[PDB]
Amino acid sequence: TYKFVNMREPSMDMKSVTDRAAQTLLWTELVRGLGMTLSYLFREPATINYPFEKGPLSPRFRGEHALRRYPSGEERCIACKLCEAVCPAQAITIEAEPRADGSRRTTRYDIDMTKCIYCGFCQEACPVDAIVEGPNFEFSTETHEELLYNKEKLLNNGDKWEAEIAANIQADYLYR
Amino acid sequence: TMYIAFILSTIFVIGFVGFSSKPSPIYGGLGLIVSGGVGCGIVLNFGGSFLGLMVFLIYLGGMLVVFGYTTAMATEMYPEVWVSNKTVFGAFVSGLMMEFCMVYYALKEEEVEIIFKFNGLGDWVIYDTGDSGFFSEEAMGIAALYSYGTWLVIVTGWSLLIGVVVIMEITRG
Amino acid sequence: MFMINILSLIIPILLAVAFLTLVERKVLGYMQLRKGPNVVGPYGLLQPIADALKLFTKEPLRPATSSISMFIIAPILALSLALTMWVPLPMPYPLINMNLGVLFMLAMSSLAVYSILWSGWASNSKYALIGALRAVAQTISYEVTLAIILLSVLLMNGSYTLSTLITTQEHIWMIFTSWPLAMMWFISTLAETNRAPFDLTENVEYAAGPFAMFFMAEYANIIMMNAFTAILFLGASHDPHTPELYTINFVLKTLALTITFLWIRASYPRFRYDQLMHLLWKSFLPLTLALCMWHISLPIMTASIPPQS
Amino acid sequence: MELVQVLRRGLQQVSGHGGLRGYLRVLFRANDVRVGTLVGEDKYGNKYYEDNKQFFGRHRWVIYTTEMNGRDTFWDVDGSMVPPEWHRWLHCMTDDP
Amino acid sequence: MNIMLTLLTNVTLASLLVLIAFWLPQLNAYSEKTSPYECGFLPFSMKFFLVAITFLLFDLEIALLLPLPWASQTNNLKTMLTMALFLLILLAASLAYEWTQKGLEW
Amino acid sequence: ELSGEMVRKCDPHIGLLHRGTEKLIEYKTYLQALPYFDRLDYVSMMCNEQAYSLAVEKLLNIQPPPRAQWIRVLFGEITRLLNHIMAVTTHALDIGAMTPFFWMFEEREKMFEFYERVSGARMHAAYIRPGGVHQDLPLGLLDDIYEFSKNFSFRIDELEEMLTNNRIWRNRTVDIGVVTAEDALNYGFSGVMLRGSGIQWDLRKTQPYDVYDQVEFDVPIGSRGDCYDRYLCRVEEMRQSLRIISQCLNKMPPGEIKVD
Amino acid sequence: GRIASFLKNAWAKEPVLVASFAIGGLAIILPSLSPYTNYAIRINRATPYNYPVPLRDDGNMPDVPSHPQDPQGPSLEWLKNL
Amino acid sequence: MWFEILPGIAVMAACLFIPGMATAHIHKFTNGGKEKRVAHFSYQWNLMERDRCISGVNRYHVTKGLENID
Amino acid sequence: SRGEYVVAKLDDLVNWARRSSLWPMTFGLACCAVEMMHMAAPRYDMDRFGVVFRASPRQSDVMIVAGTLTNKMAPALRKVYDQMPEPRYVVSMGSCANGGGYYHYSYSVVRGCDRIVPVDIYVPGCPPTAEALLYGILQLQRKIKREKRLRIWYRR
Ligand code: SF4
Ligand code: SF4
Ligand code: SF4
């Protein structure tokens, strides 16, 4: 149940003492370690050639948030605002009004990525699969204002990444 | 370059004035390193290669480095140069002036005599025409210490060992 | 033409140091399963140039030096001594042939120590002085053992002439005769250049250019010390008609020794000041003294006293 | 010996990039000189290659186009240039090009 | 003259590089860091000096041991060997004294 | 307060990363509070979630499904490998040995992929949630876990080859920071600190949680209480963790991943 | 007996010092107990650093060699054999 | 892989090779296509100074043989 | 003109040197430091790009704020930043460094390192993946490449 690390008495056999002194004087263990690093030298390096080569990723990856649309072209978001509630960082700000047609369409869907923790609770909460974190992890900006994403920005992100987002959802919806 | 040795000797005197002006220890230590390096040059010019490297390796390399070690750990001084406050600046300038007066009275007047008689002729004259063959007179004589100077070796070694003892006894508090 | 020789000794060494930086980066990376600089130029061949240009354009900050005078002399001394130490080295023919070249090398290393003291003292920084004094202590212990080992190995050379080492090691490398001294000598060289595991991580006040020159001087000293080890122990065949053979073999040996310097750097944890000095005073020094006794007695008892001339 | 085979493979890589000019071009634009089957090319011009022999992470790579969306990318190879559909395959989200 | 030339060239090259590294790079205008060296105010431990004095003495004994290579050519080999061994034994004795007594504290 | 080179009073000043997490938790729901625990120990992420999940489940008087408990333990031991790799490598890196850090960090990168494959995020997963785990393992994940664990033992041995026997490493660790067993208990030390001094205590054994009672492993116990023994303990914990991982990969039961 | 245990203990605990004492001790005892020490002395004397100043022949010096190379005089054949 | 380091090492090797080759070539070029003579002891220098006089052009490299005699 | 051509080419040379040999300082504060280490880990290997982790802030060019900048740590960050030599660039990694992220409404968390120090590149994520951080550094390199410090001096 318990193992004794260390706790090993040294044998005082003259041969054993001789080998121990040989290790001390001839620096055997240091040579052993040196050989280990030399072996590491002749291995194949594990560096990928960024950005020409990208690291492995799974379909469940969570990244840039994106607002999706139905195949007809109507925004899936029906302004339930439960994604706003579930958001543990209070990053989503949703304001909705009855559209000219009469449906629940948000007039404001603002998420500050600078406050979002990329948890993924929003996509798990949405009952129409509207807000789904996309696959894009490389969206660094130079100004803080850019991080704060408007509803228009989210819609454009959805339109840009829709193919991949839909493919990933199709590849993962069964697990969810 | 016939008077190179004289130039070196003058620079040696200048450095001695520099560190003898008692400046800030750090600046003085340099005044001594410079003079020490010059003196090594003079010794080399006379042919004492081993002795020239002796002062460079021991005096400049170790003796003055341990001196600097102390000045660095016990640093309680306001840094100042040789041309700083008049106490050091005036002393440095006056020493240089005395040396220059000696030089002028030595070159313009061949037989300069202050306390000893000096001749203004270039030091190259004093060099002796002779061949040592496959020999290093300096090296051979110094190596003879182990053969001829056994007594010197004994006394010097005992002095060194007792010096270690004394240093510890003094710096035990 | 002699000035041409001086330039052909100085400039190539500096370029070699510049590329040694890249070589070290790549070697350490590939020993860490990483690719060293590979983007800046083909295989990173332009990396040292990029580093130099960036350094000589970075805003130099002033470190409130108590004595600019001294703060500026320290880099000059380090670089000049590093350049000078290469002069007596016999690549088969030395630039300046000294009967006592070995002692000249030792003296030059001894003066180099001052650069450390001057840098810390003039830096006006308590931590700087402390670290500088630690460097003084480290180089203090190496010099004793280094001198003893050098004397003991030269007891079979017959003089302090560096060129004679080639003749002495004509048939057999000196290492096969004095391998324990070789081990202690290599470790002492590591200690001298503060190469790991004898570093004291955590003259930093130097900014850009000054720092760059101190770095260059240190790495040139690394290469020079490895060359000294090569000439001392790893003798090379010299054909008087074709010296290029000796030059090639010697260069290869020096490169191997520098590669071993990097290989040790990324193989072992750094020592502690107490441990480093309890090595260079209580393990190496007694053994060096005993081996010096042995290397004095051996030529006499074996009638193998080398020729004086 | 196998060393000769390695050198010959290097020369084959030189040829496979379309001569010395292309070999240097991929060497200085991508810092990699291995060749692989051209899986496909997007409309923007980026070409995608896959070599199963290479270990996971370097099996698939993309050579970015010289000009994309009215921007010179001969040297400025932005990581976001990859189109969304190729993003899945390149990032190993799916095994289907 | 050759060695003097080498020394001159090395020193001048180093000083020129120091010039182009201390005064040339600071010509480029980089605004002004109005940042004062905020200073508001001594570890003279023997632990350091002891390392220094002992080194001085051991270096002195090493100086006496330098002429050994040429001393091996003497006809009085027995006497030279005895003296050399004596100097080495004294070095070892000094080291032993410090080690056995309160020394080598570094 | 240093007597030149000797430490007399080392006053640790903390709060440079005090973010008021506990107060923020009070203003958020139980589900919303789970991501906070991932941040607390940013080296061991899922282990933090498990502790919070068990606490909520205990108050809820519910039992996570059997499959989830095995999944929690499997990733929990994977998480233990992550921290022990980080602890040993970074400790060696600060001491000076830099090569082992990069060697084991690639394996750490591989394990991060396992996190991302099952949760979609590399470090912070929020996968272990009160009631079970968020989703079921993606088809093929277990197979890759077996492949990594198969070759991971060699990597640990390579680490030992470069550190364990190295005299410099021993000099920097042996007889350093020795803690008496009685002091460790009184000072509230736990984990490796207790085991390092010889105290035979391990919650996974004494107070089994989830299915740790259904796995067989050995608790490394120190003998001298110095840093070196604790270094050996952490290494051995990595080895015994692989033992637990193999068992979990061979005992993963069929079922749901959340309480029904 | 007791000394033998001490040596084993010393080599077990401080092998470096034990080796240093042994090497130093041999470097003192072995020189006296070596026949080539006599040769080493002779070789040093044999080496003709300085000119062998000739002596004026008086007619009563049979041993002294009054010739370039004939049997009279010292021989270096011993060294040649070595 | 590991052979990627070889370029930098080769460049450094050429840089280090330049000094020794330069020294040898300059020595031979300035010393009449012969190894530069050494003067470690006065006797060697005395031979050089005599050789300089014998040459007649104040250069020790040029050596006069039996043709110069008689 | 010829003067413009010379200045532009020299400016490009200076830009190349700095962007090629960027030396970052690891201001690792929180979880994001771990991913930063994974960037320097063999898989990504920032050193391959010439970006070598310079421990000394006095010899650094990029300050990567990785973690939650608390009020207690805030003065230290600025003081370290002004002790950096120029040109100096600040890269904010992580939502906590960007705008406080999970702790935006905390009583002792700075609402973004932008308040304390001017930021050049913001890397989003919690934690941003090592590639994203590597992407940000490359974006900073391109940002340096676009800089025309000399050209503006000549055209002044
Ligand atoms: S949860 Fe979905 S449907 Fe509801 S407001 Fe958010 S995006 Fe719209
Ligand atoms: S992923 Fe998380 S942080 Fe981002 S919007 Fe959704 S709930 Fe908020
Ligand atoms: S952004 Fe996320 S990972 Fe980074 S420090 Fe903040 S909470 Fe931690």
Q: Work out whether strand F132-133 and strand F128-129 pair parallel, antiparallel, or are unpaired.
A: antiparallel
Could you tell me where the DSSP H helices lie in E23-104? Answer: 46-65, 68-71, 77-100
Query: G10-17, long-range: CB within 8 Å, 24+ apart, which pairs?
Result: G11/A17, G11/A18, G11/A21, G12/A12, G12/A17, G12/A20, G12/A21, G15/A20, G15/A21, G15/A24, G15/A25, G16/A24, G16/A25, G16/C283, G16/C286, G16/C287, G17/C286
Kindly determine whether residue H12 and residue C16, on different chains, have CB atoms separated by under 8 Å: yes
Which atom belonging to ligand 2 lies closest to the Cα atom of I126?
Answer: 3
Please indicate whether residue A149, judged by its CB atom, sits closer than 6 Å to ligand 2.
no
A94 DSSP β-pair partners: A109
List all residues of chain C from 270 to 309 with a beta carbon under 8 Å from chain G. Answer: 283, 286-287, 289-291, 293-294, 296-305, 307-308
- Contact residues for I146 (Cβ-Cβ < 8 A; gap 6+): none
CA distance F212 to F250: 14
Contact predicate C277/C141, CB 8 Å: yes
Residue A13 CB contacts under 8 Å (≥ 6 apart), including other chains: none
Determine the angle formed by the axes of helices C244-265 and C179-192, rounding to 10 degrees: 70
For the CA of A131, the closest atom of ligand 1 is 7
SS3 letters for I59-99?
HCCEEEEECCCECCCHHHHHHHHHCCCCCCEEEEECHHHHH
CA pair distance C227, C239, nearest whole angstrom: 19
User: Which of helix, strand or coil describes residue B18?
Assistant: helix
Residue D93 phi, psi (nearest 5): -70, -35
Q: Decide if G16 and A24 are in contact by the 8 Å CB cutoff.
A: yes
Torsion, CA D66, CA D69, CA D72, CA D75, rounded to 10: -60
Q: Sketch the domain layout of chain B as residue ranges.
A: 4-172
Using left for φ > 0, alpha for ψ between -120 and 50, and beta otherwise, residue C196 falls in: beta
Spatial separation of the C-alpha atoms in residues A168 and D10, rounded to whole Å = 39
Is E97 within 8 Å of chain B by CB?
yes
**What span, in angstroms and rounded, lies between the C-alpha atoms of F9 and D87?**
56
Choice from A65, A77, A97, A122 to test ligand 1 binding pocket (greatest atom count within 8 A of CB): A77
> Taking chain A, what is the end-to-end CA distance rounded to the nearest angstrom?
39
Q: Would you say the CB of residue I94 lies under 6 angstroms from ligand 3? A: yes
**One-letter amino acid identity for E42?**
L
A80 Cβ below 6 A of ligand 1: yes
The rounded Å distance from CA I68 to ligand 3 centre is: 7
I58 close contact with D: CB closer than 8 A: no
How was it solved? Answer: cryo-EM
F112–I38 C-beta distance less than 8 A? yes
- Phi and psi of B111, rounded to 5°? -95, 80
Q: What angle do CA I147, I149, I151 make, to 5 degrees?
A: 100
Give residue for tokens 């070697």.
C27
Q: Does residue E30 lie in a domain region? A: yes
Tell me, rounded to whole angstroms, the distance of Cα H9 from its chain centroid: 28
- In angstroms, the first-to-last Cα distance of chain E is 44
Best CA proximity match to I85, nearest among C54, C214, C212, C207: C207
Q: Kindly give the number of the ligand 1 atom that is closest to the alpha carbon of A78.
A: 3
How is residue F197 written in tokens? Answer: 């001094």
Q: Which residues in chain B touch residue G50, judged by CB atoms under 8 angstroms apart?
A: 133
Q: Which helix (H) or strand (E) holds A2?
A: strand A2-4
CA atoms of A162 and H17, how far apart (whole Å): 61
Q: What is the rounded distance in angstroms from the CA atom of residue B90 to the CA atom of residue E51?
A: 38
Residue C67 DSSP class: T
Pick the residue of D56, D78, D87, D90 with the most I CBs within 10 A to test the interface with I by mutation.
D78
d(CA B105, CA G22): 65
Cis preceding-peptide flag for A10 (omega within 30 of 0) = no
Residue A29 and residue F167 in contact, taking contact as beta carbons nearer than 8 Å: yes
Here the contacts of B116-119 (C-beta below 8 Å, separation 24 or greater) are: none
Q: How many Cβ pairs closer than 8 A exist between chain E and I?
A: 6
Cβ–Cβ of A12/G8 closer than 8 Å?
yes
Closest CA to B43 of B138, B120, B129: B138
CA–CA distance, C92 with H28 (Å, rounded to integer) = 12
Minimal C-alpha gap between E104 and chain G (Å): 15
Contacts 24+ apart (CB under 8 A), B156-165: B156/E64, B157/E61, B157/E64, B157/E86, B157/E87, B157/E90, B158/E90, B160/E57, B160/E60, B160/E61, B160/E64, B160/E90, B160/E94, B161/E90, B161/E93, B161/E94, B161/E97, B163/E57, B164/E54, B164/E57, B164/E94, B164/E97, B164/E98, B165/E97
DSSP state letter for I41: S
| Topology of the domain covering B4-172 | Four Helix Bundle (Hemerythrin (Met), subunit A) (1.20.120)
Instruction: Tell me which chains share at least 3 CB pairs under 8 Å with chain E.
Output: B, C, F, G, I
Least CA distance to A53: which residue of chain D?
A: D61
E35–I82 CB contact, under 8 Å: yes
C-beta of A137 in contact with ligand 2 (< 6 A): no
Copy the structure tokens of residue A16: 């054993």
CA distances from B151 to E77, E85, F206 (A): 16, 14, 78
Q: Counting ligands in written order, which one lies closest to the CA of residue A76?
A: 1
> Which range marks the domain in which residue E58 is found?
1-101
Query: Measured between alpha carbons, how far is E42 from B101 in angstroms, rounded to an integer?
Result: 45
B and E make contact (3+ CB pairs below 8 Å): yes
Nearest to A38, CA basis, from F92, F163, C263, F155: C263
Q: Quick check: bond before I24 cis, omega within 30?
A: no
Mutation probe of ligand 1 site: the residue of A90, A94, A153 with most atoms within 8 A of C-beta: A94
Is the residue at E87 inside a domain?
Answer: yes
Would you say F238 and F85 are in contact if contact means Cβ atoms under 8 Å apart? yes
CA distance C264 to C270: 10
Distance of CA C219 to the CA centre of its chain: 8
Residue type, B47: G
CA distance I107 to chain F (A): 7
Using a 10 angstrom Cβ sphere, with 0-12 exposed, 13-18 middle and 19 or more buried, the burial of residue F93 is middle
Q: Is residue A125 within 6 Å of ligand 1 at its C-beta? A: yes
Residue whose CA is at the smallest distance from ligand 1 atom 4:
A80
Torsion angle in degrees (nearest 10) through CA of F126, F130, F133, F135: -80
Which chains contact B through at least 3 pairs of Cβ atoms less than 8 Å apart? C, E, G, H
DSSP-based three-state secondary structure for C220: helix
What is the pairing mode between strands B117-119 and D37-41?
unpaired
Q: Is A129 exposed, middle or buried (0-12, 13-18, 19+ CB in 10 A)?
A: middle
State whether G12 and A20 contact (CB < 8 Å): yes
Chain F positions touching C36 (Cβ under 8 A) are none
Q: What share of chain A is helix, strand, coil (3-state, %, to 5)?
A: 35, 15, 45
- Please, how many CA atoms are within 13 Å of residue C206, restricted to the half-sphere of its CB? 28
Q: Are A57 and F113 in contact (CB under 8 A)?
A: no
CB contact under 8 A, C266 and F166: no
CA–centroid distance, F27 to ligand 1, in Å, is 23
Residues with Cβ within 8 Å of residue F198, at least 6 apart in sequence: F181, F221, F222, F223, F225
CA atoms within 13 A on the CB side of I137: 35
Angstrom distances, CA of residue E74 to CA of B60, B132, B151, B157, G44: 30, 17, 17, 21, 6
Residues in CB range of C187: below 8 A, 6 or more apart:
C279, C284
In single-letter form, the type of residue at position C36 comes to G
> Cβ(I123)–Cβ(I154) under 8 Å?
no
CB F219 within 8 A of CB F151: no
Q: Kindly state whether C30 is in contact with chain I, defined as any CB-CB distance less than 8 angstroms.
A: no
* Burial of D71 (C-beta count, 10 Å sphere; 0-12/13-18/19+): exposed
Residue G22, token pair as written in the block: 């042994």
Q: CB–CB of F172/F209 below 8 Å?
A: no
Question: Which one of the ligands is nearest to I102 CA?
Answer: 3
User: Per the structure block, which two tokens stand in for E45?
Assistant: 């431990």
The three-class DSSP label of residue B120 is coil
Contacts of B7 (CB under 8 A, 6+ apart): none
A125 CA closest ligand 1 atom index: 1
Contact I150, I15 (CB under 8 A): no
Rounded (5°) CA angle F80-F84-F88: 175
B vs E: CB pairs below 8 A: 113
Rounded Cα distance between A63 and A174, Å, is 20
State how beta strands D47-50 and D37-41 pair. Answer: antiparallel
**∠ at Cα C237 (C234, C239), nearest 5°?**
155
Q: How many CB pairs under 8 A join A and H?
A: 6
The answer to whether the CB atoms of F166 and C31 lie below 8 A apart is no
Q: Is A100 helix (H, G, I), strand (E, B) or coil?
A: coil
User: Locate tokens 């003066």: which residue?
Assistant: C111
CA distance A91 to A85: 10
Q: What angle do CA F105, F107, F111 make, to 5 degrees?
A: 110
The distance in angstroms from the start CA to the end CA of chain H is 72
**Phi then psi dihedrals of residue I93, to 5 deg:** -105, 125
CA distances F195 to A147, C170, F67, F157, F222, Å, are: 47, 60, 31, 22, 6
Task: Look at residues C281, C286, C153 and name the one whose alpha carbon lies nearest to residue G25.
Answer: C286
Resolution (Å units):
3.2
Question: How far is it, in rounded angstroms, from Cα E9 to Cα C87?
Answer: 12
**Ligand 3 centroid – CA C29 distance (Å):** 29
Q: State the helix-helix crossing angle for F227-251 and F66-95, rounded to 10 degrees.
A: 150
Phi-psi region at A79: left, alpha or beta (left = phi > 0; alpha = psi -120 to 50): left
Count of domains observed in chain E: 1
List the structure tokens of A169.
Answer: 């959802």
3-state secondary structure of A149: strand
- The Cα–Cα gap between F124 and F121 comes to 6
DSSP state of C174: G
Q: Which atom of ligand 1 is nearest to the CA of A94?
A: 5
CB of A84 closer than 6 A to ligand 2?
no
Number of Cβ atoms within 10 Å of the Cβ of F188:
8
Cα–Cα distance between I10 and I152 in angstroms, integer? 12
Tokens (6 digits) for G13: 């605990």
CB I132 within 8 A of CB A137: yes
The CATH number of whichever domain residue E19 belongs to comes to 1.20.58.1610
Chain A hits for C267, Cβ within 8 Å: 30, 33-34, 36-37
Residue A113 Cα: closest atom of ligand 2 = 4
Q: Report the alpha-carbon distance of residue B150 to residue G60 in Å, rounded.
A: 40
CB F176 within 8 A of CB F225: no
- Residue identified by tokens 């010292």 is G74
**Strands A65-67, A131-133: pairing kind:** antiparallel
Pairing of strands A92-98, A104-112: antiparallel
DSSP code, position F2: B
**Domain for residue E32, yes or no?**
yes
Q: How many beta carbons lie within 10 A of that of residue D59, not counting itself?
A: 16
> Is the residue at E50 inside a domain?
yes
- Alpha-carbon distance of B146 to C217, in angstroms, equals 39
Residue pair B83/B92 in contact by the 8 Å Cβ criterion: yes
CA separation, residue F61 to residues D94, F90, F204, F260 (Å):
41, 40, 21, 13
Among candidates F178, F184, F216, which has minimal Cα distance to F199? F184
CA of A62, closest atom in ligand 2: 1
From the list C194, A49, B173, the residue with the least C-alpha distance to D64 is: A49
Nearest partner of B25 among B80, B91, B86, B93, judged by Cα: B80
E106 within some domain: no
Query: Looking at the complex, does the CB of residue A43 fall below 8 Å from at least one CB of chain C?
Result: yes
Task: Tell which residue, H59, H42, H43, has the closest CA to residue H51.
Answer: H59
Q: Round to whole Å and give the CA distance between I100 and I123.
A: 13
Structure tokens at F134: 């968020």
Other Cβ atoms less than 10 A from the Cβ of G62: the count is: 8
Enumerate the residues of chain A whose CB falls inside 8 A of the CB of residue F113: 56, 58
Paired with I24 in beta bridges are I62
By the 10 Å C-beta count (0-12 exposed, 13-18 middle, 19+ buried), I17 is classed as buried
β-sheet with A148-149: strand ranges across: A92-98, A104-112, A148-149
- Residue to mutate, I96, I98, I105, I106, ligand 3, most ligand atoms under 8 Å from C-beta: I96
A12 touches chain G (CB under 8 A): yes
Q: Work out the burial of residue H38: count CB atoms within 10 Å of its CB; fewer than 13 is exposed, 13-18 middle, 19 or more buried.
A: middle
User: CB-based contact (8 Å) between C12 and chain E?
Assistant: no
With CB atoms and an 8 Å threshold, state whether C296 touches G24: no
Closest CA to H9 of G68, F243, C252, G69: C252
Q: CB under 8 Å to E4, separation ≥6 — which residues?
A: none
CA–CA gap between residue F150 and residue D80 (Å, rounded): 36
3-state secondary structure of D30: helix
State if residue A79 touches ligand 2 by the CB under 6 angstroms criterion: no
* Chain A residue nearest residue D47, CA to CA: A52
Using CA atoms, how far apart are residues H29 and C232, in angstroms rounded to an integer? 28
